[PDB]
Design an enzyme around this catalytic site. Structure first.
Site, PDB file in Angstrom:
ATOM      1  N   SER A   1      -5.352 -20.142 -25.999  1.00 30.91           N
ATOM      2  CA  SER A   1      -5.989 -18.827 -25.984  1.00 30.91           C
ATOM      3  C   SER A   1      -7.020 -18.757 -27.107  1.00 30.91           C
ATOM      4  O   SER A   1      -6.660 -18.874 -28.277  1.00 30.91           O
ATOM      5  N   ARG A   2      -8.304 -18.576 -26.783  1.00 30.22           N
ATOM      6  CA  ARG A   2      -9.395 -18.516 -27.767  1.00 30.22           C
ATOM      7  C   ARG A   2      -9.641 -17.110 -28.303  1.00 30.22           C
ATOM      8  O   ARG A   2     -10.420 -16.952 -29.237  1.00 30.22           O
ATOM      9  N   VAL A   3      -8.968 -16.093 -27.766  1.00 29.86           N
ATOM     10  CA  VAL A   3      -8.758 -14.815 -28.470  1.00 29.86           C
ATOM     11  C   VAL A   3      -7.641 -14.985 -29.506  1.00 29.86           C
ATOM     12  O   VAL A   3      -7.816 -14.638 -30.673  1.00 29.86           O
TER      13      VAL A   3
ATOM     14  N   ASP B   1     -11.937 -17.245 -21.570  1.00 28.11           N
ATOM     15  CA  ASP B   1     -11.566 -17.216 -22.986  1.00 28.11           C
ATOM     16  C   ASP B   1     -10.358 -18.115 -23.307  1.00 28.11           C
ATOM     17  O   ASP B   1      -9.790 -18.041 -24.387  1.00 28.11           O
TER      18      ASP B   1
END
Lengths: 349, 47, 464, 504, 119, 114, 92
Positions: free
Chosen positions: D359-361, D334
């Site tokens: 961070s793709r969250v 992620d």
């Protein structure tokens, strides 16, 4: 026999390519889904052949020569075997008369003559199809004369094209009336590797039947990289050990015996001819790769379409350094030899 | 003094280019050798 | 009488049947695993006949715990999926079992997944431009309504931001019905998409199929054919126009490689299966807009190691009407969505379909970015200051055009905190016409990032 | 006749015999009732995994010392699918990948067993990542926050501190673990694949000295053992962890390093004579890592609200982040925290590349105080890095760029920290406040790190209500912020720089 | 190992050259007909080097120090033979003709040499 | 030089030296431009670019490629012409005069055509 | 180089397993057992000697191909000849 047509019980066919000591290794030329172990096979008694004739003009056909345009069955004149030998050195004549493409950057600089092979090599989306379809469209001005010693018939062989691309080519030819004298052989992307391998040969058989009858023919193969991939798939399923770049050992003999079968005959054989425009799609713009350097060495000249000339407004995007025709100004009218005679060397300089 | 600065800059840009090209040329040496070995061994195992 | 399991090698299982009772190709066979906590009914699909009444099968579930000699029962039909208007709203796995309500769809009409592509007589080429409201896409790669569209690129550059953006540009407002196919993307995105489509209240109008990366390659390839069988029902039987989003269709070819090497077929170039272009063809040609009814499909394509000459990217390029190509290099400049302007393409970008006032601008932008991409070899050593004035003029607007192809997307709002922007096509053409003529040459490069339209360009430039 | 032959063949405590052995694989005759991926045992106390089940022999990969195997040995069924013992009794132990103790500390009081190949929780069982996994690294919790149930890739070169960042993350959890509530009480797994024995021992000492061995378990596959142990060490790591996760605990997994698992599965597959794809890896190396990393998730409350967080480490061959295994794992996780070695040698430690890490969250999992204070810092450091790449050769400089460039240099000096010093979030937010609100603008670049460390001990001894107010509410309120700006100004007067002067 | 364990002495094991241990392992793996890995080395490589390097260590107050002359093929530190080897070793001493020619014995280059215990 | 005689060997080795130094300089000239070089190097590049073109010839079989008829150049005239070229005695001619031309009588006639 | 290329022909016809660049496993040993017979003997063996000048040919000046890498490691010294210096006038 070796390369006999087999008949399987769904009406689907195949070709006997390996004859082992105890079994026949066959390729299925159609919908393989219907095949079961233990079912019957009948031989046909025929070495691999296709129906031919002038009834094919305006039709779209499977590689086995049956129609897919939906306009009903074709009144074929005879069958012809797909693997008859090329006209030998004594039967041929010099190329001397032009195939008018109507594109300045070709016709002046790298001419195409009746009985030449000219490789339209390039990258994705550079104009390869556009040059060839425009060439087939330009011939209408000759066809309307009705004279068999100057009108050109065409065959466009779509290998691995998607079905809407073939339907786009068809209506782009109908817009210019070229479906009056063009046949399309279609092995669309869905069809099994047998059809995708075979399509160039059945194109060459439909073409040869008009050629030996004294007519002038133009073949476009679009594109021989998808035939080379289909023959790789067939060879590896048959478990032949691959040669270089995972291709079969004899991938050169796949293309040589396809392209050598188009030439100008002597006047002792009606003086007909067949002109071949094979296309090759080069990955990452390198001309110095295995399959393209085979077909560059089999054909008589190159129209190398480069994407970084296409982008900068030089359209059609012929790289004038690498591009050549090795018949040259023997395949041009006198006026064009006087006017354009050095133009390729002046631009490469 | 501006030439000195611009030429130090051009030398350090060329040193970063020789590094990046070398890190590409090695990845291509290794791929070429591995493709050649895959192609030899696939033939030797077919037999 | 029924068959027995006789060999097991990972997800590939050989089964022996009685002399006359051998199944056809692509039939579904059941088998039982009865160890303990791991127990389940397997589905196997028939992939080859090996002779002497023996067939080789591909398992739709992990074979872990299967034991030699268990009985296998032939169902006499291919893997089947539920189809109907009642399929919309729900989430399915490849076998057509519903994940949201386990008993659901059992009573619906079941179609076989394995079906022939449409007859060539029924094909017609599409030309109708789709307006997405993204600058780089609407200008240089105009998408086709009813076409096949794709988003290429190496890992970690923007497939999932850009596919959820395209869902927000198209499927939020589209008048027909949508299908989404998760073919081997990460499961966390499947859950994020299943929650988001309920928030946006789009979920009532779409069906989701999932085959995420945990699943064995036999199902991870059949998921695309499963989801496509629900789409081609909505196309053929209901007569609606359809959207078919597929993510990621490289994983279909990769699952085909993983089963093929266990089927024992010889490796092709870089260890793909042979038949790669035939398996990819047998999928891709079914996704086509037959005369009078349309299936707008958008496909993400992974590129391993950024190697745009790899056989899987290289085979799938042939099937596509518009191809957006993402790049690592453009992403490293901070340019989002990180589309490469020179490598990306659309088949409808010509003056007869888009009009001359669009086409001239799109050719002038490409010529400028090309002349810059040629100078990059000198720029990397000597900077800008060595160049001749006919080049230095061009590079100073190339660097502005390059940045002005960036946009603040609606999807990225959840990360940057900036709101999203849509621009109409006429404002896009008028902006790039003014940039190439020179009407913005005096503004600093830093102004042009992540703007949107011309009025927002002005508002931002006034603050610097 | 044929029915009597089939009835007899059905009629066949079963024991097999090794018919072939070599290099870490063996073939067994017999065992007509063995499950695929059943765990075998061999006479020397050696185990194996029945991968391939032919018509007349079973192909088994060998786990541990394959030197003890020879033709004509007996083998027997254990009756268990490939599984490991599991339970709370693994906390504070070092184990080999089979779950046998390797510390010599005593036997393991295992609760039950778990099969390695149990499928991950499906799209309907998971929940949105919405809860902070505090790492305690300023460079990570300010710019690339990790939430519980995220997979965050720690990709870097050799010898850049990848193991050190993960040992910091496991040490930070002690300030949570002292609290009894399973909602706060994160517990950890550290799996060493292909590490040196002295590195696993050094990490075991560092985790004892910080008290983290109350709640860590170590799986050790050191570089001396057979490729089979190196291949399993991640899966057994996840299978020790999952048992706690599905019981509603919170788990952290560190894979150190997941590239040396790929180089083990390349070994096992090439000894099995399967043909390779790209880079000589077998075609299924994507299905090796994804089957591993998809087990990491946050569950929905219906299933018991546990979660497992993955920090897979990857080693990169001279920073070629476009290589095959790097791009396979960047495609699964992620986000990533690329540790650029060029910055590590200049003494920026941890060497986080603030442009390439993501961070793709994102800010769904970062506490409102940190999200407010730090939220600008990423873009401010990225525009400082390009402004520094320009200004290295700038012939004249403006007073605005000269002020921004000096702030950027003092923010880069602010972010670094020494090894084994995790900072609590209530101290991280104050450390980033000093930089972002400009209180460091009169402190010289040599003193900044000592100033930030001393102010955090000042505010720890007196004015503790700053940290208590931040911890109890997760937000930095104005009625505490005025006391913070006051205490910073009161400390600025009493501080002294090692060179130069006192300050405002 | 006998001098470390039974005599109870410290030991210094020179290896010249650890690259030829990798090469000879690849040639035995090829004579055994096993499929070769990346750039042609044995599939066991990172374990087969491990079974030698992990064994050079201190225990119970006695130690086996090692010096290892390592050749690099083509001068690239990414190739599996050096890239496996440099995972194990803790320090790098480099000798330079440009320092020897100044008369500076023992000719250790102070900038090109490096150590991982210098912290 | 024992077989062809030293006059041939000197000229052949001088022509190769010049074309090798030119091929080494092409990568400098493509980026920094010919105006940057030493006077001896810039003089050598102007000789090399003429030599490269004077190694081209109108072959008889190239009648269909060029339209011009073909030509044969004697060995002695070939040696004398490259001896003069390497010593700069044609550096006053335009660069395009040497291309495809054949011998010295043709070179003069094309330099008078320009 | 033609010693090695002749041994590879023999070995692949005998179906022996190929390694890198299709050479059989033992090609370092083929060159080594040849070259390591060159030596200087002691006085008790009459003080004779043998001096080896092996030649090899390198494709496009590479020195990382299998045979050049083997012989560069077996020999005591390496006189790299280069075609660029041959053209520039530096002969030999």
């Amino acid at each position: 026999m070796t390369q006999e047509l087999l008949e399987f019980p769904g009406g689907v066919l195949g070709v006997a390519l390996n004859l082992d000591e105890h079994s026949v290794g066959a390729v299925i030329l159609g919908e393989f889904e219907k095949i079961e172990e233990g079912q019957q096979v009948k031989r046909t008694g025929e070495v691999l052949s296709v129906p031919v004739g002038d009834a094919f003009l305006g039709r779209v056909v499977n590689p086995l020569g049956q129609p897919i345009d939906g306009q009903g069955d074709i009144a074929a004149e005879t069958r012809r075997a797909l693997e008859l030998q090329a006209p030998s050195v004594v039967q041929r004549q010099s190329v001397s008369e032009p195939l008018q493409t109507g594109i300045k950057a070709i016709d002046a600089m790298t001419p195409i003559g009746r009985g030449q092979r000219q490789l339209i090599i390039g990258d994705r989306k550079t104009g390869k199809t556009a040059v060839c379809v425009d060439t087939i469209l330009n011939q209408r001005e000759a066809w309307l004369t009705g004279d068999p010693k100057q009108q050109v018939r065409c065959v466009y062989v779509a290998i691995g094209q998607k079905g809407t691309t073939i339907a786009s080519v068809k209506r782009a030819l109908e817009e210019g009336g070229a479906m009056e004298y063009t046949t399309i052989v279609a092995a669309p992307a869905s069809d099994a590797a047998g059809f995708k391998w075979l399509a160039p040969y059945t194109g060459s058989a439909i073409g040869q039947h008009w050629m030996y009858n004294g007519k002038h023919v133009l073949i476009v193969f679009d594109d021989l990289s998808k035939q080379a991939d289909a023959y790789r798939a067939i060879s590896l399923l048959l478990r032949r050990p691959p040669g270089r770049e995972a291709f079969p050992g004899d991938v050169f003999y796949l293309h040589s015996r396809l392209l050598e079968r188009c030439a100008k005959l002597s006047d002792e054989l009606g003086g007909g001819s067949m002109t071949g425009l094979p296309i090759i799609e080069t990955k990452a713009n390198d001309i110095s790769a295995f399959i393209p350097t085979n077909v560059i060495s089999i054909t008589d000249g190159q129209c190398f379409l480069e994407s970084d000339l296409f982008n900068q407004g030089v359209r059609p995007a012929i790289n004038v350094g690498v591009s050549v025709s090795r018949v040259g100004g023997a395949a041009q009218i006198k006026a064009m030899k006087e006017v354009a005679g050095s133009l390729r060397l002046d631009l490469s300089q | 003094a501006s030439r000195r600065r611009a030429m130090k800059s051009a030398t350090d840009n060329a040193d970063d280019l020789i590094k990046a090209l070398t890190l590409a040329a090695n990845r291509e040496r290794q791929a070429q050798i591995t493709q050649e070995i895959s192609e030899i061994v696939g033939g030797a195992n077919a037999l | 009488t029924a068959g027995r399991v006789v060999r097991i090698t990972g997800p590939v299982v050989d089964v022996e049947f009685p002399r006359g009772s051998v199944p056809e190709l692509f039939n579904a066979l059941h088998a039982e695993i009865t160890f303990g906590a791991l127990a389940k009914t397997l589905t196997l699909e028939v992939a080859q006949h090996l002779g002497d009444s023996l067939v080789r099968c591909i398992s739709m579930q992990p074979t872990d715990g299967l034991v030699r000699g268990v009985e296998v029962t032939d169902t006499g039909a291919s893997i089947s999926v539920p189809v109907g208007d009642g399929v919309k709203g729900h989430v399915f796995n490849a076998l057509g079992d519903c994940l949201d309500d386990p008993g659901y769809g059992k009573d619906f009409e079941h179609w076989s997944i394995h079906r022939k592509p449409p007859a060539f007589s029924d094909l017609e080429p599409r030309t109708e431009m789709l307006e997405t409201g993204l600058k780089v896409v609407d200008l240089l790669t105009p998408y086709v309504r009813g076409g096949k569209i794709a988003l290429f690129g190496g890992a970690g550059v923007g497939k999932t931001v850009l596919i959820q953006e395209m869902i927000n540009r198209i499927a939020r407002n589209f008048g027909g019905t949508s299908v989404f196919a998760g073919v081997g993307e990460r499961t966390r995105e499947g859950n994020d998409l299943w929650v988001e489509l309920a928030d946006a209240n789009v979920l009532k109008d779409t069906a989701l199929v999932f085959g995420q990366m945990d699943e064995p390659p036999g199902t991870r390839m059949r998921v695309a054919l499963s989801a496509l069988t629900m789409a081609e029902f909505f196309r053929d039987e209901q007569g609606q126009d359809v959207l078919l989003f597929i993510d990621n269709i490289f994983r279909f070819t990769q699952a085909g490689s993983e089963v093929s090497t266990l089927l024992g077929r010889m490796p092709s170039a870089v260890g793909y299966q042979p038949t790669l272009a035939d398996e990819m063809g047998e999928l891709q040609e079914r996704i086509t807009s037959t005369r009078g009814r349309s299936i707008t499909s958008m496909q993400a394509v992974y590129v391993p190691a950024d190697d745009y000459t790899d056989p899987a990217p290289a085979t799938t390029f042939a099937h596509l009407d518009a191809t957006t190509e993402l790049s690592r290099a453009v992403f490293s400049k901070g340019i989002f969505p990180a589309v490469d302007p020179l490598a990306s393409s659309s088949t409808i970008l010509d003056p007869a379909i888009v009009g001359d006032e669009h086409y001239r601008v799109a050719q002038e932008v490409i010529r400028i970015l090309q002349r810059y991409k040629d100078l990059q070899d000198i720029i990397a050593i000597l900077g800008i200051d060595e160049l001749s004035e006919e080049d230095k003029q061009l590079v100073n607007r190339a660097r502005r055009i390059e940045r002005f192809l960036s946009q603040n997307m609606m999807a990225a709002e959840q990360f940057t905190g900036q709101p999203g922007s849509t621009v109409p096509l006429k404002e896009t053409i008028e902006a790039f016409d003014k940039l190439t003529k020179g009407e913005f040459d005096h503004l600093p490069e830093q102004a042009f990032f992540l703007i949107g339209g011309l009025d927002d360009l002005a508002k931002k430039a006034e603050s610097l | 006749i044929e029915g009597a032959i089939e009835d007899y063949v059905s009629s066949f405590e079963e024991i097999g015999t090794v018919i072939d052995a070599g290099d870490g694989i063996a073939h067994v005759e017999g065992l007509p009732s063995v499950m695929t991926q059943e765990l075998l045992e061999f006479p020397g106390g050696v185990l194996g995994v029945a991968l391939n089940l032919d018509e007349h022999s079973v192909g088994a990969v060998i786990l541990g010392e394959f030197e003890k195997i020879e033709e004509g040995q007996q083998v027997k069924r254990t009756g268990e699918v490939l599984s490991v013992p599991v339970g709370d009794a693994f906390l504070g132990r070092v184990v080999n990948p089979l779950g046998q103790p390797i510390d010599g500390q005593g036997d393991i009081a295992a609760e039950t067993r778990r099969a390695l190949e149990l499928q991950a929780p499906s799209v309907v069982q998971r929940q949105s990542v919405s809860e902070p996994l505090q790492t305690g690294i300023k460079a990570i919790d300010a710019m690339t926050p990790i939430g519980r149930g995220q997979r965050q890739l720690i990709i870097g070169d050799r010898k850049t501190g990848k193991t050190a960042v993960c040992v910091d993350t496991i040490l930070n959890q002690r300030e949570a673990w002292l609290t009894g509530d399973p909602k706060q009480q994160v517990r950890c797994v550290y799996v060493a694949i292909g590490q040196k024995g002295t590195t696993i021992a050094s990490v075991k000492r560092a985790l004892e000295e910080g008290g983290a061995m109350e709640y860590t378990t170590i799986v050790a596959a050191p570089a001396s053992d057979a490729a089979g142990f190196k291949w399993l060490a991640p899966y057994t790591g996840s299978a020790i962890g999952q048992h706690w996760m599905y019981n509603g605990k919170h788990v952290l997994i560190v894979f150190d390093d997941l590239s040396k698992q790929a180089d083990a599965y390349r070994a096992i597959s090439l000894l099995l004579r399967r043909p390779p794809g790209r880079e000589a890896f077998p075609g299924d190396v994507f299905y090796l890592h994804s089957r591993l990393l998809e087990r990491c998730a946050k569950l929905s409350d219906e299933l018991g609200g546990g979660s497992m967080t993955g920090l897979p480490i990857i080693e990169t061959k001279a920073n070629d982040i476009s290589a095959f295994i790097p791009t396979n794992v960047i495609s699964i996780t992620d986000g990533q925290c690329f540790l650029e070695s060029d910055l590590f040698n200049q003494g920026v430690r941890p060497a986080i590349n603030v442009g390439v890490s993501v961070s793709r969250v994102g800010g769904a999992a970062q506490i409102k105080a940190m999200k407010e204070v730090a939220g600008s810092l990423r873009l401010d450091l990225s525009q400082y890095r390009e402004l520094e790449a320009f200004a290295a050769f700038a012939s004249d400089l403006d007073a605005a760029s000269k002020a921004q460039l000096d702030r950027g240099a003092r923010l880069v000096e602010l972010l670094k920290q020494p090894q084994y010093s995790p900072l609590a979030v209530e101290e991280q937010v104050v450390a980033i406040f000093l930089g972002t609100q400009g209180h460091l603008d009169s402190v010289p670049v040599e003193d900044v790190q000592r100033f930030e460390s001393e102010l955090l001990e000042h505010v720890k001894a007196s004015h503790s209500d700053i940290f208590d107010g931040i911890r109890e509410t997760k937000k930095l309120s104005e009625e505490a912020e005025e006391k913070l700006v006051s205490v910073i100004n009161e400390f600025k007067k009493g501080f002294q720089a090692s060179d130069g002067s006192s300050v405002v």
